[PDB]
């Protein structure tokens, strides 16, 4: 309901001061520690909402594990809390006792946010807690997240890689259905100043339950985004950016191919593209003549490519202007 999503925004937010953190301080930046940061912030958004909606901690899903292999080969289970000292004795039993780091990341980690939107505080919408299951993608596009390219122009407003193609992804989804419910999308490195070098980011979110349809306030032939790999037309590193592109207008259609897409890629932005009159389709469904859904797997990957889109009708343009080939 609406205060799930205005917690999962703020916890959003908490995500991306975490993803900010290990690039704008020098002793996290010198610092497998994607796969610590992936771990950590996933870890941070589900004990966020156990803790504030009890019983929600179960219903979380990720693309991470919550067990982490240290440098010894010990398996470490990532649980937080609930002290900030212990939080530091599990990430230096992490980091081979590395204390400056580890009190860092246990700072960041236990510092709160109050980050609100005006728009979504009067919006009063229920909705049972049993139905809920919730799909993290904790940092999406890790790649250019540690590339850190801070300097790319963008081609039409659509950024070919950077950091701006970094998104974390909190989608909610309807456990019996498998239909997507609401999502957040949270690009915490939208705009940096160069005299001060600090990046601030956007959040973006949607619901669509039992026919309300409601989504965040969006700025002001065909376009159409692929990825790097892909195998008018614009390339864009990210999954959630690429969904992202489609939400805010910058592309029409956003295709990929292979079967590398999974739950967690796409079932936030695919609430905001419900709440919006768009979604996302199976692509070899449609290449062969069907929604997304996100409570039965294969094994949590998207089979069979998808196609992201926000209208109808520039979906069925597209669709039957090349099956004509
Ligand atoms: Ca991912």
Redesign the pocket.
């Known amino acids: 309901m609406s205060d799930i999503l205005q917690e999962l925004l703020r916890v959003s937010e908490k995500a991306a001061n975490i993803a900010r953190a290990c690039r704008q301080q020098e002793t996290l930046f010198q610092l497998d520690f994607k796969t610590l940061a992936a771990v950590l912030v996933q870890e941070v958004i589900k004990e966020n909402m156990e803790n504030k909606f009890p019983g929600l901690g179960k219903k979380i899903f990720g ?1 991470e594990s919550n067990e982490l292999t240290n440098d010894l080969g010990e398996k470490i289970i990532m649980r937080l809390g609930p002290t900030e000292e212990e939080t530091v004795a599990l990430l230096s039993k992490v980091l081979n006792g590395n204390k400056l780091a580890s009190e860092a990341l246990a700072k960041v980690v236990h510092q709160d946010v109050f980050f609100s939107d005006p728009a979504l505080d009067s919006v009063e919408i229920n909705i049972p807690q049993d139905i809920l299951g919730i799909w993290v ?1 904790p ?4 790649y250019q997240y540690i590339k850190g390219s801070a300097d790319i122009t963008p081609n039409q407003g659509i950024f070919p890689s950077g950091l701006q193609c970094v998104t974390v ?1 909190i989608g909610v989804y309807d456990i019996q259905t498998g239909v997507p419910l609401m999502g957040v999308i949270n690009q915490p490195f939208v705009s940096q100043d160069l005299h001060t070098r600090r990046w601030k980011g956007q959040c973006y979110w949607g619901l669509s339950y039992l026919g309300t349809n409601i989504h965040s306030l969006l700025p002001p032939s065909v376009v159409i985004s692929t990825s790097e790999k892909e195998t008018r037309i614009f390339r864009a590193a990210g ?2 950016y690429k969904s992202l592109c489609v939400i805010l207008g910058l592309a029409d259609i956003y295709i990929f191919s292979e079967d590398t897409t ?1 739950k ?2 796409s079932c936030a932005a695919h609430a905001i593209l419900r709440a919006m009159g768009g979604g996302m389709v199976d692509l070899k469904e449609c290449l062969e003549r069907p929604q997304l859904v996100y409570h039965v797997g294969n094994q949590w990957a998207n089979k069979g490519g998808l196609i992201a889109y926000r209208s109808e009708k520039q979906l069925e343009t597209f669709l039957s202007r090349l099956l004509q080939h």
């Open positions: 693309e993608d940092i999406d596009s890790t992804l999954a959630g999974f967690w890629d």
